[PDB]
């Protein structure tokens, strides 16, 4: 029994830093939201921003729930967010999760 009308997905959850972060890169792993606005999600969007300065910019966008950010600074924190989109549109971002990159280290493997 329909209630009203479909729409964008609710506030998704914050991405969980996958494995271990890097100097200028970081891995994340999130999942599908509970409230898809009634419609089956289509694509997600991760907007990262340097806690230091409010400069949010879509760093990832696809159908997967796990990606790897790059072009960042080591020993520095970065507020990441998450948002899902459906046939209706994009919804609100998730809780800004602050993640501190690596202090800069590692062997020479290529």
Tab-separated table of C-alpha atoms in Angstrom:
chain	number	residue	atom	x	y	z
A	1	UNK	CA	0.000	0.000	0.000
A	2	UNK	CA	1.711	3.137	-1.284
A	3	UNK	CA	2.088	5.923	1.277
A	4	UNK	CA	3.206	8.915	-0.763
A	5	UNK	CA	6.052	8.915	-3.278
A	6	UNK	CA	9.629	7.708	-3.743
A	7	UNK	CA	12.667	9.930	-3.301
A	8	UNK	CA	16.395	10.223	-2.516
A	9	UNK	CA	18.152	7.924	-0.010
A	10	UNK	CA	18.464	9.019	3.606
A	11	UNK	CA	21.715	9.853	5.431
A	12	UNK	CA	24.157	7.024	4.725
A	13	UNK	CA	26.862	5.876	7.139
A	14	UNK	CA	30.514	7.014	7.250
A	15	UNK	CA	33.135	4.992	5.329
A	16	UNK	CA	35.443	2.758	7.366
A	17	UNK	CA	39.150	3.173	6.616
A	18	UNK	CA	40.187	-0.046	4.874
A	19	UNK	CA	43.303	-1.841	6.077
A	20	UNK	CA	45.844	0.908	6.701
A	21	UNK	CA	46.085	4.465	5.306
A	22	UNK	CA	48.956	5.799	3.197
A	23	UNK	CA	51.048	8.966	2.966
A	24	UNK	CA	49.104	10.574	0.119
A	25	UNK	CA	46.493	7.834	-0.267
A	26	UNK	CA	43.808	6.116	1.807
A	27	UNK	CA	41.473	3.139	1.431
A	28	UNK	CA	37.821	3.128	2.498
A	29	UNK	CA	35.066	0.522	2.791
A	30	UNK	CA	31.391	1.409	3.213
A	31	UNK	CA	28.048	-0.247	2.535
A	32	UNK	CA	24.480	0.349	1.311
A	33	UNK	CA	22.207	2.589	3.425
A	34	UNK	CA	19.105	1.339	5.238
A	35	UNK	CA	16.813	4.006	3.788
A	36	UNK	CA	17.147	3.962	0.000
A	37	UNK	CA	14.222	6.362	-0.248
A	38	UNK	CA	12.177	3.389	-1.388
A	39	UNK	CA	14.178	2.939	-4.582
A	40	UNK	CA	17.182	0.629	-5.117
A	41	UNK	CA	20.426	2.609	-4.980
A	42	UNK	CA	22.146	3.179	-8.324
A	43	UNK	CA	25.447	4.921	-7.592
A	44	UNK	CA	27.303	6.297	-4.572
A	45	UNK	CA	29.512	9.361	-4.119
A	46	UNK	CA	32.344	9.996	-1.661
A	47	UNK	CA	33.219	13.615	-0.888
A	48	UNK	CA	36.514	14.057	0.963
A	49	UNK	CA	37.539	17.312	2.643
A	50	UNK	CA	40.647	18.401	4.594
A	51	UNK	CA	39.500	19.002	8.168
A	52	UNK	CA	41.965	21.898	8.078
A	53	UNK	CA	39.965	23.629	5.344
A	54	UNK	CA	36.413	23.105	4.090
A	55	UNK	CA	37.180	21.962	0.544
A	56	UNK	CA	34.803	19.052	-0.185
A	57	UNK	CA	35.187	17.561	-3.663
A	58	UNK	CA	33.879	14.324	-5.175
A	59	UNK	CA	36.919	12.041	-5.032
A	60	UNK	CA	35.017	8.889	-5.982
A	61	UNK	CA	31.774	7.926	-7.719
A	62	UNK	CA	30.546	4.530	-8.876
A	63	UNK	CA	28.471	1.472	-8.004
A	64	UNK	CA	30.992	-0.080	-5.616
A	65	UNK	CA	31.162	0.613	-1.879
A	66	UNK	CA	34.956	0.575	-1.621
A	67	UNK	CA	37.576	2.809	-3.238
A	68	UNK	CA	41.024	4.318	-2.691
A	69	UNK	CA	41.647	8.052	-2.334
A	70	UNK	CA	44.912	9.677	-3.415
A	71	UNK	CA	46.638	13.033	-3.896
A	72	UNK	CA	46.594	13.787	-0.167
A	73	UNK	CA	49.132	14.919	2.431
A	74	UNK	CA	50.818	12.625	4.987
A	75	UNK	CA	50.514	13.178	8.727
A	76	UNK	CA	47.333	15.112	7.976
A	77	UNK	CA	43.683	14.373	8.751
A	78	UNK	CA	40.848	14.436	6.217
A	79	UNK	CA	37.080	14.441	6.739
A	80	UNK	CA	35.391	11.929	4.436
A	81	UNK	CA	31.679	11.553	3.699
A	82	UNK	CA	29.294	9.214	1.877
A	83	UNK	CA	26.114	9.687	-0.156
A	84	UNK	CA	23.941	7.376	-2.254
A	85	UNK	CA	21.881	8.180	-5.349
A	86	UNK	CA	18.820	6.580	-6.942
A	87	UNK	CA	16.413	7.069	-9.847
A	88	UNK	CA	15.216	10.045	-7.802
A	89	UNK	CA	18.527	11.743	-7.068
A	90	UNK	CA	21.409	12.150	-4.630
A	91	UNK	CA	20.788	12.280	-0.892
A	92	UNK	CA	22.544	13.842	2.120
A	93	UNK	CA	26.130	12.892	2.959
A	94	UNK	CA	27.072	10.717	5.934
A	95	UNK	CA	28.872	11.657	9.150
A	96	UNK	CA	32.188	13.360	8.390
A	97	UNK	CA	34.738	10.703	9.342
A	98	UNK	CA	38.153	12.180	10.127
A	99	UNK	CA	41.051	9.968	9.044
A	100	UNK	CA	44.736	10.628	9.715
A	101	UNK	CA	47.083	9.600	6.904
A	102	UNK	CA	50.450	7.918	7.442
A	103	UNK	CA	53.436	9.880	8.813
A	104	UNK	CA	55.234	8.995	5.595
A	105	UNK	CA	57.140	5.713	5.506
A	106	UNK	CA	57.524	2.374	3.749
A	107	UNK	CA	60.015	0.231	1.801
A	108	UNK	CA	60.936	0.630	-1.869
A	109	UNK	CA	58.600	-1.743	-3.705
A	110	UNK	CA	57.516	-1.260	-7.307
